[PDB]
Design a protein around this ligand. Structure first.
Ligand SMILES: *Cc1cc2c(cc1C)nc1c(=O)[nH]c(=O)nc-1n2C[C@H](O)[C@H](O)[C@H](O)COP(=O)(O)OP(=O)(O)OC[C@H]1O[C@@H](n2cnc3c(N)ncnc32)[C@H](O)[C@@H]1O
Ligand SMILES: CCCCCCCCCCCCCCCCCC(=O)OC[C@H](COP(=O)(O)OCCN)OC(=O)CCCCCCCCCCCCCCCCC
Ligand code: HEM
Ligand SMILES: CCCCCCCCCCCO[C@@H]1O[C@H](CO)[C@@H](O[C@H]2O[C@H](CO)[C@@H](O)[C@H](O)[C@H]2O)[C@H](O)[C@H]1O
Ligand SMILES: O=C(CC(=O)C(F)(F)F)c1cccs1
Ligand SMILES: O=C([O-])CC(=O)C(=O)O
Ligand code: SF4
Ligand code: F3S
Ligand code: FES
Ligand SMILES: [K+]
Ligand SMILES: [Mg+2]
Lengths: 612, 139, 240, 102
């Protein structure tokens, strides 16, 4: 009807061509599955290409290491909200994953022995947090994500993966609680496409563009997590948004955490290395949630830098210039383009900036999307997720640096391995209904001819400034409630939307309008879950509830303590639902998985005080 | 599911039959000295080959020999300024093509490929072209 | 206190039957805009004309999406400073000599297919140990990859080469050729001879006449012209 | 054989350097040996050079064969006429000196 619909039949479909999407794509083709990869961008344009710091793995190239030490760092970094069974799988597969990347042709930096160079990063240590700073961040200078993605894209050219570049996925094809595939729009010719497959993998990235100032690309609009919301399925831990400590002032471009890992320090208006006061042990290499909160207090008290006193400096000129050109060549050019600063003489102005989304589509450690009904987890048949768009959850309330690129390839491969051990290639494609996805086209046509009062760019800016001022680093009850009533008003104001481009071929006005619907659904669940969560854990800091509320008071011996009921403590995942018609947010909770894959091989870490 | 050669064939298949325009190029791109010196090297090269071919055809078709036409021109008693301009116009394309040909041969060794070195070598060719042409024409 | 800057942008709509290419002029106040050209394009799309179409993503010059011809030269809009001289109008065109999908969006399918033809991935003779141990590579052998692996595949260089204009169907172009060289001198690759023999034809490599528009216009400061010359040296010296 | 493209590229640079060396030889040691050497170098260097121009600007199976066939005829008559001038007339080196003495 009006739009020519093209039906496709595959064994599996992967939405997304980033780090996680590519690894799952040709991994399925490597297992013999007729696979389709649907992506709204050319694969090398995805936000993974902008990753700088590196990828963590206990290779032991700089000193003696152990992946169980990396396991402990991630669990403590997550503030005991991450699932320790997923963390176990990621940290154990980390050495084999990075070796697979180097064997693909990734031009890692090298040591005097010819092995992969590793630098220090924030929140990593040896001997289960007792043996000093660890050096397990494998990097390609400071262009690690650029080389990781280009290496993965080159490798994917060796398999029969049917690519569909610049296709915008609209919704999931659901039937009886099972996923039948995806429906998408071809941006080149303007035709609707329905991809039928037994399994579907969602690797669409995060939604950093819900805020006014972010490090993410313009295309990080959380399209896959919005499709999950429209399918009636929940999203997990969306209120945990990571603020990277050093985002450049103005343009918001990321200055890698590797700067502080090579010797960089932070100074305020008095030239004080103030991180020695907040974190006497970790100094500038503490966790990002701690460093970001430390920088914010220094600014709001009155020790900021610049003419407006709204930022601080990142000093690098004390380091030798050869190390700056060899280890950090990327940020040296970026600091000159977007600030006019020479890192060998003057520091870089930086401030906390929205960077990464800890929350996402809830999955198990195998990549299978799960729902939570009556206190038990239920694997959603035929639906998978990996990457930033998923919630393993390996990151919990705060992700450690260089752990996301690891997440991408580890759980992208896990999705392909899980499908290979569950289904057989060539099995009968699950049939759909002759009208599957008709509401997706009806929404696209409505926005295509929208002639209202508020244009799409006008509504997006109102959402971004609302999140920026109401769901910032430090939050409180009264301000979070004021942001909820605004976004719900903004979401209702989407009926007044107005577009100007009536074409269908490369109608970026229409495409960015669809992304606004996706950004709003992510913004609603983020700020509503933040208001409900009355505690302080990880990146979620409540100035009205400044304490971490677990099932026990782990700051004292548990001998003789009464366990807090599940409905009275907050050590649990937040599960959000949204009625897409009205915009009301419904919140439920599920317990955090504390078990590992093998207690004898990797001991579970009980909650304890978190300090750096 | 499509090889590189299949993707290339599909590219020209759907683009040559469509109504898509071809974006402008030569009429809009900003010129530079190395770019302008690249086409001049090709222009002088072709002009020199067509001059050798015309001289070769004249030796096969003209009823008289070369010493006769030299005396004909020498009897017209042309002004030394006009004789200098004719010699300069004949030696200039040969001089430019010769020096810039040496510049090409250095490139074929992999030397002087920095953009600033490309500008230096081009300016060196321009001044040597003028000096060599003016000196030979003054003989 | 407004500082009006004028932009003349190439326009064409495929959904309009019989639409002919044109140049549309916009007025932007630089005091209420970002310092980069992409910031002006995003400001125009958000406020003046939502029908203006262009590729963009990273807005930091790493993804290579916003490649276009600004002020006569190919560059990245997100890293190109806006000319503050209000007397002259900045002209913006798509990448030169490319089939225009819409406005400033060219068709890069052939450019991508050429990058696939050189097999841009690591190849070994004994690939039976794929994923067992890390390959060894000295710091000096790793330094040889500097200036080559940083290519973002924006195609600013190839769309600036006149040889790629006339023979784009069979000439690979500086972007693809430099990546082919990136895998030729990788000490971990074992197919250096096979990658050279692929270019034993009059078009794939030898259409390069060292015009050097490619190195001038590269937004990453790379030298694809020099890499092509190193390929030529290897082509004339290797033995079978 | 299988390296026809790279050998032709090397032969072009060798003839260019050879032709470059004949320019001082024509001024220092003018005579029949340099006259016929210039006749062979100018023809071969120009024939390969104009072939690169045809390869760049001429497209289509029939127009390519026609342009390349006419280039062989042009180069053949060029080399033949230069060899005629060197045997029946004063030669290349002497003709230039007579032209510059005007
Ligand atoms: C922003 C950022 C993140 C980052 C980093 C530096 C920056 C500037 N540096 C990192 C580092 O040094 N180490 C590390 O561990 N992580 C770092 N990060 C975070 C990390 O890079 C990201 O979390 C990760 O790269 C995300 O990868 P993922 O594969 O999950 O997703 P993506 O690369 O962003 O690409 C998303 C793909 O999805 C497709 N898409 C999106 N919407 C659609 C629709 N509607 N239809 C079809 N396809 C869609 C996109 O095309 C894209 O390919
Ligand atoms: C281009 C046209 C030819 C340009 C020639 C440039 C050099 C002219 C010249 O001044 O030659 C002088 C030289 C010596 O003669 P003279 O000065 O009397 O001194 C005698 C004692 N040594 O005379 C000589 O001894 C001969 C040395 C020069 C030989 C040059 C041979 C190659 C010429 C290739 C020209 C190709 C293009 C031709 C274009 C015009 C075609 C009509
Ligand atoms: C008398 C000469 C004639 C008739 C002649 C002719 C030509 C022609 C027709 C070309 C082709 C131009 C192109 O492909 O763009 C060419 C190119 C060239 N010439 Fe000459 N030439 C002469 C003298 C010289 C000398 C003395 C040198 C030294 C030289 C070096 C070169 C080189 C290196 C090229 C290659 C250009 C490229 O690869 O782009 N030439 N010549
Ligand atoms: C007979 C043979 C005659 C050959 C020359 C013929 C006349 C050619 C004139 C073309 C000059 O074209 C001009 O070249 C210069 C130097 O490359 C360019 O300048 C370029 O490099 C300079 C110096 O790094 C930069 O400042 C400038 O931003 C850049 O555009 C200029 O932008 C272009 O407009
Ligand atoms: O083909 C050209 C010139 C050309 O297209 C331009 F004039 F630049 F457009 C050249 C080939 C060799 C030297 S210039
Ligand atoms: O997100 C990370 O893992 C770290 C990061 O961007 C960086 O500072 O390089
Ligand atoms: S070489 Fe420079 S210009 Fe050509 S594509 Fe790679 S980066 Fe863009
Ligand atoms: S622009 Fe063109 S022909 Fe050769 S050196 Fe650079 S490629
Ligand atoms: S937008 Fe990514 S390069 Fe300009
Ligand atoms: K996530
Ligand atoms: Mg209303």
């Amino acid at each position: 009807t009006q739009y020519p619909v093209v039906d496709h039949e595959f064994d599996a479909v992967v939405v997304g061509a980033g780090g996680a999407g590519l690894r799952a794509a040709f991994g399925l083709s490597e297992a013999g599955f007729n696979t389709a990869c649907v992506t709204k961008l050319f694969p090398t344009r995805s936000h993974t290409v902008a990753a700088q710091g590196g990828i963590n793995a206990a290779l032991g190239n700089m000193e003696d290491d152990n992946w169980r030490w990396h396991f402990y760092d991630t669990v403590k970094g997550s503030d005991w909200l991450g699932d320790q069974d997923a963390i176990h799988y990621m940290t154990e597969q980390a050495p084999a994953a990075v070796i697979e990347l180097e064997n693909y042709g990734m031009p890692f930096s090298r040591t005097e022995e010819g092995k992969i160079y590793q630098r220090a990063f924030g929140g990593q240590s040896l001997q289960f947090g007792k043996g000093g700073q660890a050096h397990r961040c494998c990097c390609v200078a400071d262009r690690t994500g650029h080389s990781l993605l280009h290496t993965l894209y080159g490798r994917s050219l060796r398999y029969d993966t049917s690519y569909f570049v610049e296709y915008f996925a609209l919704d999931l094809l659901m039937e009886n609680g099972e996923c039948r595939g995806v429906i998408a729009l071809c941006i080149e010719d303007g035709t609707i496409h329905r991809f039928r497959a037994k399994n579907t993998v969602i690797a669409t990235g995060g939604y950093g563009r819900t805020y006014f100032s972010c490090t993410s690309a313009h295309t990080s609009t959380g399209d896959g997590t919005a499709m999950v919301t429209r399918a009636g399925l929940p999203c997990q831990d969306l209120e945990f948004v990571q603020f990277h400590p050093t985002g450049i002032y103005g343009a918001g471009c990321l200055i890698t955490e590797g700067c502080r890992g090579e010797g960089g320090i932070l100074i305020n208006s008095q030239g004080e290395r103030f991180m020695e006061r907040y974190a006497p042990v970790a100094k500038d290499l503490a966790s990002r949630d701690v460093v970001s909160r430390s920088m914010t207090i220094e600014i709001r008290e009155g020790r900021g830098c610049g003419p407006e006193k709204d930022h601080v400096y990142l000093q690098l000129h004390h380091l030798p210039p050869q190390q700056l050109a060899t280890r950090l060549p990327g940020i040296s050019e970026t600091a000159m383009i977007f600030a006019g600063v020479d890192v060998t003489k003057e520091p870089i102005p930086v401030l906390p900036t929205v960077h990464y989304n800890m929350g996402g589509i809830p999955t198990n450690y195998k990549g299978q999307v799960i729902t939570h009904v009556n206190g038990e987890d239920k694997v959603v048949p035929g639906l998978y997720a990996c990457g930033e768009a998923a919630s393993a959850s390996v990151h919990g309330a705060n992700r450690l640096g260089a752990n996301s690129l690891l997440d991408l390839v580890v759980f992208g491969r896990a999705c392909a391995l899980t499908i290979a051990e569950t289904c057989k290639p060539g099995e009968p494609v699950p049939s759909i209904k002759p009208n599957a996805g008709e509401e997706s086209v009806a929404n696209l046509d409505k926005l295509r001819f929208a002639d209202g009062t508020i244009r799409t760019s006008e509504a997006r800016l109102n959402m971004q400034k609302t999140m920026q001022s109401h769901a910032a680093v430090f939050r409180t009850g009264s301000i979070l409630q004021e942001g909820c009533e605004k976004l719900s008003q903004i979401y209702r104001d989407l009926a007044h939307l107005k577009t100007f481009d009536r074409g269908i071929v490369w109608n970026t006005d229409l495409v960015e309008t669809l992304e606004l619907q996706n950004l709003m659904l992510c913004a609603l669940q983020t700020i509503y879950g933040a208001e409900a969560r009355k505690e302080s854990r990880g990146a979620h800091a409540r100035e009205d509830y400044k304490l971490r509320i677990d099932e026990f008071d782990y700051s004292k011996p548990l001998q003789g303590q009464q366990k807090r009921p599940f409905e009275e403590h907050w050590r649990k995942h937040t599960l959000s639902y949204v009625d897409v018609k009205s915009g009301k947010v419904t919140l439920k909770y599920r317990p955090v998985i504390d078990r590992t894959l093998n207690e004898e091989d990797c001991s579970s870490v009980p909650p304890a005080i978190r300090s750096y | 599911a499509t090889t590189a050669k299949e993707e290339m064939a599909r590219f020209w298949e759907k683009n040559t039959k469509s109504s898509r325009p071809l974006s402008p190029h030569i009429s809009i791109y900003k010129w530079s000295l190395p770019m302008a010196m690249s086409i001049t090297h090709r222009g002088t090269g072709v002009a020199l080959s067509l001059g050798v071919s015309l001289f070769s055809l004249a030796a096969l078709l003209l009823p008289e020999q070369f010493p006769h036409y030299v005396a004909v021109v020498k009897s017209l008693s042309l002004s030394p300024a006009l004789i200098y301009s004719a010699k300069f116009a004949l030696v200039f394309p040969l001089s430019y093509h010769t020096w810039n040909g040496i510049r090409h041969l250095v490139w074929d060794m992999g030397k002087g490929f920095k953009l600033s070195q490309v500008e230096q070598s081009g300016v060196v060719v321009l001044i040597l072209t003028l000096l060599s042409s003016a000196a030979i024409a003054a003989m | 206190t407004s500082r009006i800057k004028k932009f003349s942008i190439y326009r064409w709509d495929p959904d309009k039957p019989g639409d002919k290419p044109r140049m549309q002029t916009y007025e932007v106040d630089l005091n209420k805009c970002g310092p980069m050209v992409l910031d002006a394009l995003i400001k125009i799309k958000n406020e003046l004309d939502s029908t203006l179409t262009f590729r963009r993503s990273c807005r930091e010059g790493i993804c290579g999406s916003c490649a276009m011809n600004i002020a006569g030269g190919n560059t990245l809009a997100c890293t190109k400073k806006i000319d503050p001289d209000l007397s002259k109008t900045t002209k913006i065109y798509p990448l030169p000599h490319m089939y225009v999908v819409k406005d400033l969006v060219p068709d890069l399918s052939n450019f991508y297919a050429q990058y696939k033809s050189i097999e841009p991935y690591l190849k070994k003779k004994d690939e039976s140990k794929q994923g067992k141990e890390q390959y060894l590579q000295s710091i000096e052998d790793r330094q040889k990859l500097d200036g080559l692996y940083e290519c973002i595949l924006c195609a600013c260089c190839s769309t600036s080469c006149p040889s790629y204009w006339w023979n784009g169907d069979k000439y690979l172009g500086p972007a693809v050729l430099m990546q082919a060289y990136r895998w030729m001198i990788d000490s971990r690759d074992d197919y250096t001879e096979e990658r050279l023999a692929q270019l034993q034809d009059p078009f794939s490599l030898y259409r390069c006449h060292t015009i050097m528009n490619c190195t001038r216009t590269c937004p990453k400061g790379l030298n694809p012209g020099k890499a092509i010359a190193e390929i030529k040296k290897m082509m004339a010296t290797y033995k079978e | 054989s299988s390296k026809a493209a790279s050998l032709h590229w090397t032969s072009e640079r060798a003839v260019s350097a050879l032709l470059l060396g004949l320019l001082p030889a024509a001024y220092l040691y003018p005579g029949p040996a340099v006259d016929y050497s210039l006749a062979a170098a100018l023809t071969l260097h120009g024939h390969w050079g104009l072939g690169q121009v045809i390869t760049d600007y001429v497209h289509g199976d029939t127009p390519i064969k026609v342009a390349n066939t006419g280039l062989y005829v042009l180069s053949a008559i060029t080399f033949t006429g230069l060899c005629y001038f060197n045997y029946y007339d004063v030669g290349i080196c002497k003709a230039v000196a007579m032209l510059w003495s005007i």
